[PDB]
Design a protein around this ligand. Structure first.
Ligand SMILES: Nc1ncnc2c1ncn2[C@@H]1O[C@H](COP(=O)(O)OP(=O)(O)O)[C@@H](O)[C@H]1O
Ligand SMILES: [Mg+2]
Length: 338
C-alpha cells in the first residue's frame, strides 16, 4: 500500500512510575508486532498482538523514525505530489515529540539536526539539502493551523487575533482542493527560519488556549510545507512542479461534543483511510473539516502514513488498545503465526 501504518511506543515515564504502574507493551520490530498484556496483575500471561507496517520500540531514536517513515514520502513530494503524515494516539504518548521533537539543552547553533529533533525540522533540513544539492530553482513556504471544535485557527499570522475563525473556499484549480482564506504562509529561505516559525506557532497555541480553552491536546495541528520547484528546458520552457507535505499532529484520541466532535472527526478520518486502503467508492472526505483540508493530499495516488503513538504503562491499557484498534481498522494487517 501507499498507506503505511506504524506504531511507536515511548519510554515509561515518571508520572507512570509514580502510580506504581507496570510495563505491559512489548515491541518486536523484526516481526513488526506489538503485544499488549491484557490480564492485569491477576493474569500476567494473556496478551493481544497486532501487526503493522513498522513497529518502533521505546529505544527508537528520532532519526530512525524519520529515515523509515518520512524519507520515502519526501521523495514523492519532491517529484511534485501532495502527501500527508499523521500522528495519532492518546495525550502524553508522543505525537508532538514525534512530529516536532525538542532541541539541545545546549543552545549553540549547529547545522546538523538535534538527536531529539522531530519530523518537522528534519523534513525542512532535507528539503533544503536535497534541492540545493541538485541545483533546482525552488522556494519553500509553510503554514500552521489548528482545528479546535470544528473551527480553524491560524497559528502564524503576525497581525490577526488568533481567535478569528478561518473560512474554507472551493479551489478553482482543483476540485479536490480548498483555499483557506487568510491563512498565513511564511516563506522559508533557510533551514533555520523553521525553528523561529515553530516558536511563533507555540506562542499562538498558548494564546489560543488562554482565550478559547483550545488546548493543543484537544486540537488537530496541521503543519503544511509547500515546495515550488522550477526547471527550464533546453528550449526555454519553465516547468513548475509543486509538492506539498502535510504533517498532522492530531487531537488526543482519548465537555461533550467538544470531546464528542473530536472523536467524530477522528472516526471520519479513520473511515477515509479505510476506504482508501480497501478502494471502496465512498470516501467521506466532506464530513469533517480535517478531511476536507487534506482531501487533495489523500486521493489515492500518494503516500500516506499514520504513526500511532502509545504508552507502555498499565495505567493506559484501555487507550493503548483503543489506539491499536484504530490503527488496525485503518489498514487490516493480519498476524503471522509462530
Ligand atoms: N520517544 C520518546 N522518548 C522520550 N520522551 C518522549 C518520547 N515520546 C514522548 N516523550 C515525552 O513525553 C511527554 C509527552 O509527549 P508529547 O509529545 O507531549 O505527547 P502528545 O503530543 O501525544 O500529547 C513529553 O514531555 C515528551 O518529551
Ligand atoms: Mg501534543
Amino acid at each position: 500500500k501507499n498507506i503505511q501504518v506504524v506504531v511507536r511506543c515511548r519510554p515509561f515515564n515518571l508520572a507512570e512510575r509514580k502510580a506504581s504502574a507496570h510495563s505491559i507493551v512489548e515491541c518486536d520490530p523484526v516481526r513488526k508486532e506489538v503485544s499488549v498484556r491484557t490480564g492485569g496483575l491477576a493474569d500476567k500471561s494473556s496478551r493481544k498482538t497486532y501487526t503493522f507496517d513498522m513497529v518502533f520500540g521505546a529505544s527508537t531514536k528520532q532519526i530512525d523514525v524519520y529515515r523509515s517513515v518520512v524519507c520515502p514520502i519526501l521523495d514523492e513530494v519532491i517529484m511534485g505530489y501532495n502527501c500527508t503524515i499523521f500522528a495519532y494516539g492518546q495525550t502524553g504518548t508522543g505525537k508532538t515529540f514525534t512530529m516536532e521533537g525538542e532541541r539541545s539543552p545546549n543552545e549553540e547553533y549547529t547545522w546538523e539536526e538535534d538527536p531529539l529533533a522531530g519530523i518537522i525540522p528534519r523534513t525542512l533540513h532535507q528539503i533544503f539539502e536535497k534541492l540545493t544539492d541538485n541545483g533546482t530553482e525552488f522556494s519553500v513556504k509553510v503554514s500552521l493551523l489548528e482545528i479546535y471544535n470544528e473551527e480553524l485557527f491560524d497559528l502564524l499570522n503576525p497581525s490577526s487575533d488568533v481567535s478569528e475563525r478561518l473560512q474554507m473556499f472551493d479551489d478553482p484549480r482543483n476540485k479536490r482542493g480548498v483555499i483557506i482564506k487568510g491563512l498565513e504562509e511564511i516563506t522559508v529561505h533557510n533551514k533555520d527560519e523553521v525553528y523561529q516559525i515553530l516558536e511563533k506557532g507555540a506562542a499562538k497555541r498558548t494564546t489560543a488556549a488562554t482565550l478559547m480553552n483550545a488546548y493543543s491536546s484537544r486540537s488537530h495541528s496541521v503543519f503544511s510545507v509547500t515546495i515550488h520547484m522550477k526547471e527550464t528546458t533546453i528550449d526555454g520552457e519553465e516547468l513548475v512542479k509543486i509538492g506539498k507535505l502535510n504533517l498532522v499532529d492530531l487531537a488526543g484520541s482519548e465537555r461533550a461534543r467538544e470531546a464528542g466532535n473530536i472523536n467524530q472527526s477522528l472516526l471520519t478520518l479513520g473511515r477515509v483511510i479505510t476506504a482508501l486502503v480497501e478502494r471502496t467508492p465512498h470516501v467521506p472526505y466532506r464530513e469533517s473539516k480535517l478531511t476536507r483540508i487534506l482531501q487533495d493530499s489523500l486521493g489515492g495516488r500518494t503516500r500516506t502514513s499514520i504513526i500511532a503513538t502509545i504508552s507502555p504503562a498499565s495505567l493506559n491499557l484501555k487507550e493503548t488498545l483503543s489506539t491499536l484498534e484504530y490503527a488496525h481498522r485503518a489498514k487490516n494487517i493480519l498476524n503471522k503465526p509462530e
